[PDB]
Structure formats: structure tokens, C-alpha cells
Write a protein that binds this ligand. Sequence first.
Ligand SMILES: O=P(O)(O)OC[C@H]1O[C@](O)(CO)[C@@H](O)[C@@H]1O
Ligand SMILES: [Mg+2]
Ligand SMILES: [Mg+2]
Ligand SMILES: [Tl+]
Ligand SMILES: [Tl+]
Ligand SMILES: [Tl+]
Ligand SMILES: [Tl+]
Length: 331
Amino acid sequence: DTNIVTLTRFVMEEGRKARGTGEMTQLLNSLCTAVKAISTAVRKAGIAHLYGIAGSTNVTGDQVKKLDVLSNDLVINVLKSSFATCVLVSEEDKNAIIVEPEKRGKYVVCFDPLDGSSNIDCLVSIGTIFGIYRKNSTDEPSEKDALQPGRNLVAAGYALYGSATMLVLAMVNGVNCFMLDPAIGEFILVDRDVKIKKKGSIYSINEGYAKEFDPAITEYIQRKKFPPDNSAPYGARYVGSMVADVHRTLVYGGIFMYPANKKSPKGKLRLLYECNPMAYVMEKAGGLATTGKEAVLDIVPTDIHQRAPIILGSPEDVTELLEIYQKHAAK
Ligand SMILES: O=P(O)(O)OC[C@H]1O[C@](O)(CO)[C@@H](O)[C@@H]1O
Ligand SMILES: [Mg+2]
Ligand SMILES: [Mg+2]
Ligand SMILES: [Tl+]
Ligand SMILES: [Tl+]
Ligand SMILES: [Tl+]
Ligand SMILES: [Tl+]
């Protein structure tokens, strides 16, 4: 009651014995501020007329919504002001953003300011995704500082604007969930050291793409619906917002899939600010995250807006699908 374990307190105490300049706390405190401001706009978006498009398109091809602009501006401004960052990569910006010398700190942040664009207008859960790297280079900060493999992440996670607003944060020792208290505008710890189940009973994929799926995905799905051992078939869930489907995978277990297909060699989701952050969360929770052929966190990106296939969740479910890919593997 009068001893609130806030996100700030947790990350300060975490980074205590480990020493540190304390800019990670600065960064996350700043991010939390933009997340609250996004949550409040979202929760009254119809009244504030924030539905509808902005009138523009993303890089490879994406219709930019009003809340994309708002959330993008908020995240960039708070990150800059935090004095903790030097390079920013956003889904909404064609090029990396370089922070001004005076406000530069040591971190590189890749983010999706608003994830779940197709679900905005129907009031389904949407979110914010981020991954944070330490700049390694010694030269002037540049776009290349963002082109690190996922395994180099120091922290990653997401905000979920669902039935409640939740900040899920993964760092080297594990995953923790903080719920926004709307009364005092603080993220409070509600789930400690989260670990995903070894095996789940939900599969999550858009079967609208059945016609384009590779034979391994096709086989796996058939197996969920017609188990060979007479076990009960898996239930299906696909909210359509990566943050919502991945969060459910984390807390209920199971598998989430956005694979490569006949029209999309690399899938749809973006490696730097969608796939890597979630793969990292999953791995810190004891889960797996693969493209079907390689670990997502091991990919070395060459494009900040690069796409990747992703299959993640409970280790025994992801493994079962890898076995099918392996079985189908060819010259
Ligand atoms: O409509 P589709 O192709 O299933 O795409 C849904 C995916 O697209 C995204 O909106 C990309 O931002 C994800 O949040 C989501 O998982
Ligand atoms: Mg977005
Ligand atoms: Mg997204
Ligand atoms: Tl977008
Ligand atoms: Tl969006
Ligand atoms: Tl995407
Ligand atoms: Tl995207």
C-alpha cells in the first residue's frame, strides 16, 4: 500500500550491485513517460478523434495512422531528453535518427511506437515494442550502431495497451511485468521472474495465408488440429496484434507464428523493432524464437527495416516445428 515497487525502483536496485552510470534507469523512466501518454491517448482515442490515417506511407509499404504519428513523436522526444541514447531506430522513420551531441547517452534504441495498426480502429489490444543496445563502436554514432544481432540486446520488452496497460521488461537475468496504475501514473511490479511453460496448448497464426504456407507450417497446423496420439487439439488464438499474441504466449504458453511464405521469403514482421525484442523476451523467459532455420537473435541485420520470419513460444512447441522444418529440409 505505502511501499510501491515501481518500475523505477526495480531497475535502480537491479543496476545497483552491477554499478552503472544509471542512464538505463534514465532511459526506461523516460520511456515509461511516453508509454503513459500513449496509453492515455489510446484509452480515449475516439473522443479525441485519433482514429483514421495520417496521410502517408512507411518505408516498404504501410499506411500511417494518426496514433502512429503521436506515439512516434512521444517516444523520440522522451528518448532524446533522457540523455541516455545516441541512435534511434523507429518503424516510422526511413533512416536512423542520430541524437544531438549535447543530449547523447550510450544506448541505441530500436522501437515500434505503435504495434497492431490493423487493430487500432476496432479497439483491439495494441502496443509499443522496444529493444535497447549499448553502442560498441568508438566512432561517431551512426545507423550501423543499430545493425547488431539480437543477442547483443541489453534490455527489451513492450507496453501492452490491453484490458489493462502492462510494461513487460526483459534484461540479462530475466523477465518482469509491471502494470500501469492509472490513479498514480506509475508502473508497479505484478509478475516477477516470468517463465514460459515448456509446452502450451494454443497455436497463433493467420491461417488466411494457408495458400502461401511452406509444407512445414502446413504440416504443423494439421498436427495441432488432428493430433496423431489422440491428445486434444490445440486451441487457436490470433488477436492480430503481435504484442497481444506474444504476451498471451508468454503468460499462457504455446506458439506464435509469422513465418516465411511463398510471397514473403523473409516474413512480414521487422527484425530490429518487432522480432528481436520479442525473441529476447522469450529467451529470457525460457522460451525459443526461430525463423524456422536459425535463431532470430543470431541474425546479423544489414537493413534497419529488414524483415524476418518468426516462430516463438514454449520450447517444446517451437522445437516440434523445427523438427518438421528439419525433416523437410532440402538441398
Ligand atoms: O494481418 P496479418 O498479416 O496477420 O499481420 C498481423 C501482424 O502485423 C502487425 O500489425 C505488424 O505491425 C503485427 O502487430 C501483427 O502480428
Ligand atoms: Mg507501428
Ligand atoms: Mg508492429
Ligand atoms: Tl506503421
Ligand atoms: Tl500502428
Ligand atoms: Tl511489420
Ligand atoms: Tl511494420
